[PDB]
Amino acid sequence: PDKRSFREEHRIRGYEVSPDQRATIVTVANLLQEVAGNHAVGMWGRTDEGFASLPSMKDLLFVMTRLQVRMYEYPKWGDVVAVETYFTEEGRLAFRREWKLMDVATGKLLGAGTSTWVTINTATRRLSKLPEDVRKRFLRFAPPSSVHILPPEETKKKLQDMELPGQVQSAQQVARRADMDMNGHINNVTYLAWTLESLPERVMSGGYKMQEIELDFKAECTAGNAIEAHCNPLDDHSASFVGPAPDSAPLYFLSMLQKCDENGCTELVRARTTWSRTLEGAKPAPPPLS
Amino acid sequence: PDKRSFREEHRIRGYEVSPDQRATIVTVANLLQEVAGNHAVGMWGRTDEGFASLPSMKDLLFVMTRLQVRMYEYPKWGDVVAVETYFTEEGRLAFRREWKLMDVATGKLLGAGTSTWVTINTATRRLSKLPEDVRKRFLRFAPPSSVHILPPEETKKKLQDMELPGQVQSAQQVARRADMDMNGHINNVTYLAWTLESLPERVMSGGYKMQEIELDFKAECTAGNAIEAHCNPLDDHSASFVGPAPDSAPLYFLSMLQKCDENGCTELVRARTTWSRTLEGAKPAPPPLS
């Protein structure tokens, strides 16, 4: 009744921060994926491949289709932060995993994440309903579906359509054999990292910090595919930051990652990012109310 | 007399390992640089820039010109490892920082590192002797120069000359604004990561693990420079692994990283790597003999 969530502590490292010594969103996402994977290790153990364990999932795979992270205050280099994660039922096909990024010293809430996970068949990449025998077992580790770290009305919003070519275009990135996790799949955080290279350079230079990100994970690349990143503004004030210029408002951008060959392009990830110059660190409430 | 070394514990994360679930040499090097930087924080504090603190070094910079890492057994995903670091006097211009990579569970020694650090003038990139007033203060935190984690006769060996173009050539990598540490300089581990993309794909595929690496750090890139990686075999048995094929011996390769423009190329890093299919984890001895 209190082991329905999983908590880990990490110290923000020197190579994990931007010049303002604040952890990058890549570093935050890395911590979210590490604690989530360690939650699975605590539940089903450390198997011969790493992913959950394939117990009654021998040909099934958990795939995150939506990730939403809202940041209230970025931790700094040297800070000991705590990442608390849990998952709940989401309909009859999906699961909702959420994260609490917390400062250990003050106990305050630095950021919140929520996500949508489905089960696809490994040998068909097609959706597959977990057997009700199996789903009842996962939910033994789940808190009630009434638990929300972010307002549900502010989650699961459809992303705008991507106008192509993007106004900003990061150079052809090349997939490497290093950018592969232990399962052979490319890392989710790697898609996030490539996606944010398409952003205008004047956004980070202007002192804007990423306040919220909404990612749709649509397709997967492998090996050494060519990868292109496009970015579009979403309102006029954000369009001001594209290229050089001739109580501040927030910026909105829509970025997209795709793999390209001599046949056609295939969209990998789409992301809507919210940018602001100021935020505010908040205060939590414990999940043992269960 | 026991605070002359600095020890930190870390858990190898899921995204830090190769498909065989062993930590990559990039992950090891990342841990070496994090503990070394935290040693400086423990000595001179966390300053407004991060690098040491510029106390009587207001226009001075510590630059590592040689890094040598020997691996006895790579830790695996989930392992809690300990990194112990210290530095000693190295002549009258350089300092020798060394690392002990240890498994916390067994106490055994997983790997050893040693390095050479000089002081260059920030505003001239030219070498500059630290004042003897200042050097005497650093060495208060140093063990005697007789301390060696690796045999001195096996360190500080001149690397072979690089025949160009290399037999293997990784694609033009592009420097990004993300690949910059908090000081604006590109990260040492980033040079290491780029350098190992030039390796033949059949080396990692053949089950070979990096046994030792010797890096010379020669120049620095910035911003969005074009970066090229070349690799050459050093003996005939290693030359067998270049491209496809028509109690095992170790492989030897010489890799080089350079930045290129429309004027000329400038060498950044040169690395000699030793590759073997088997290693052996060893046993340490404490530094408090001081």
A196 CB neighbours in chain B (<8 A) are 178
B29 CB neighbours in chain A (<8 A) are none
**What number of other Cβ atoms are within 10 A of residue A267's Cβ?**
15
Q: Report how far apart, in Å, the C-alpha atoms of B162 and of each of B37, B197, B239, B267 are.
A: 31, 16, 15, 10
The length of chain B, given as a count of residues:
290
Domain boundaries, chain B: 6-276
As a whole number of angstroms, the distance between CA A230 and CA A165 comes to 7
As a whole number of angstroms, the distance between CA A130 and CA A60 comes to 8
Nearest to A14 among B15, B50, B77 (CB): B50
The pair of structure tokens assigned to B199 is 């390796």
The pair of structure tokens assigned to A162 is 């991507």
Superfamily of B6-276 according to CATH: Hotdog Thioesterase (3.10.129.10)
**B165 closest CA partner among B74, B92, B229:** B229
CATH dotted code for A157-278: 3.10.129.10
- Long-range CB pairs of B130-137 (<8 Å, 24+ gap) are B130/B57, B130/B60, B130/B93, B131/B56, B133/B56, B134/B56, B134/B57, B135/B89, B135/B92
H/E stretch holding A190 reads helix A188-195
User: From the candidates A38, A148, A185, A260, which is the catalytic residue?
Assistant: A185
A30 CB neighbours in chain B (<8 A) are 13, 15
Nearest to B30 among A15, A19, A176 (CB): A15
H/E stretch holding B139 reads none
The pair of structure tokens assigned to A251 is 């910026």
Nearest to B197 among A77, A176, A180 (CB): A176
Interchain proximity B50–A26, CB inside 8 Å: no
CATH topology of A1-156 equal to that of A157-278?
yes
**A122 closest CA partner among A38, A220, A33:** A220
As a whole number of angstroms, the distance between CA A25 and CA A208 comes to 13
H/E stretch holding A25 reads helix A25-44
Within chain A, what is the greatest distance between any pair of CA atoms? 63
Nearest-CA distance A83 → chain B (Å): 14
Q: Report how far apart, in Å, the C-alpha atoms of B223 and of each of A169, B45, B226, B230 are.
A: 17, 28, 10, 21
Instruction: Please check whether residue A5 is in contact with residue A84, taking contact to mean a CB–CB distance below 8 angstroms.
Output: yes
A188 CB neighbours in chain B (<8 A) are none
Instruction: Please check whether residue A109 is in contact with residue A101, taking contact to mean a CB–CB distance below 8 angstroms.
Output: yes
B19 CB neighbours in chain A (<8 A) are 180, 182-184
Interchain proximity B177–A14, CB inside 8 Å: no
As a whole number of angstroms, the distance between CA B230 and CA B173 comes to 12
Tell me the technique behind this structure: X-ray
Interchain proximity B178–A197, CB inside 8 Å: yes
Nearest-CA distance A194 → chain B (Å): 10
Interchain proximity A34–B26, CB inside 8 Å: no
CATH topology for A1-156 is Thiol Ester Dehydrase; Chain A (3.10.129)
- Residue B272's identity, in one-letter code, is R
- Residue B167's identity, in one-letter code, is Q
Given CB atoms, is A283 within the 8 Å cutoff of chain B? no
Torsion angle of the four alpha carbons B10, B11, B12, B13, in this order, in degrees rounded to the nearest 10: -120
As a whole number of angstroms, the distance between CA A110 and CA A104 comes to 10
The length of chain A, given as a count of residues:
290
Q: Is B43 helix (H, G, I), strand (E, B) or coil?
A: helix
**What number of other Cβ atoms are within 10 A of residue A27's Cβ?**
21
DSSP B192: H
Nearest-CA distance A37 → chain B (Å): 7
Instruction: Please check whether residue A256 is in contact with residue A269, taking contact to mean a CB–CB distance below 8 angstroms.
Output: yes
**A268 closest CA partner among A188, A200, A213:** A188
Within chain B, what is the greatest distance between any pair of CA atoms? 63
The set of residues, in sequence order, having a beta carbon less than 8 Å from that of A146 and lying 6+ positions away, is none
> Resolution in A, one decimal?
2.5
Sheet holding A60-71, edge to edge: A6-11, A80-90, A94-103, A109-121, A60-71, A209-217, A266-276, A251-260, A226-233, A168-174
Those of residues 182-221 in A touching chain B at CB distance below 8 A are 182-184, 187, 189, 193, 196-197, 201, 204
Q: Is A231 exposed, middle or buried (0-12, 13-18, 19+ CB in 10 A)?
A: buried
φ/ψ (deg, to 5) at B34 = -70, -40
Q: Is B102 exposed, middle or buried (0-12, 13-18, 19+ CB in 10 A)?
A: buried
Q: Is B144 left (phi over 0), alpha (psi -120 to 50) or beta?
A: beta
CA angle B172, B177, B180 (to 5 degrees): 100
As a whole number of angstroms, the distance between CA B180 and CA B197 comes to 19
Instruction: Please check whether residue B82 is in contact with residue B102, taking contact to mean a CB–CB distance below 8 angstroms.
Output: yes
Instruction: Please check whether residue B177 is in contact with residue B245, taking contact to mean a CB–CB distance below 8 angstroms.
Output: no
Burial per residue of B24-57, b for 16 or more beta-carbon CB atoms within 10 angstroms, e otherwise: bbbbbbbbbbbbbbbbbbebbebeeebbbbeeeb
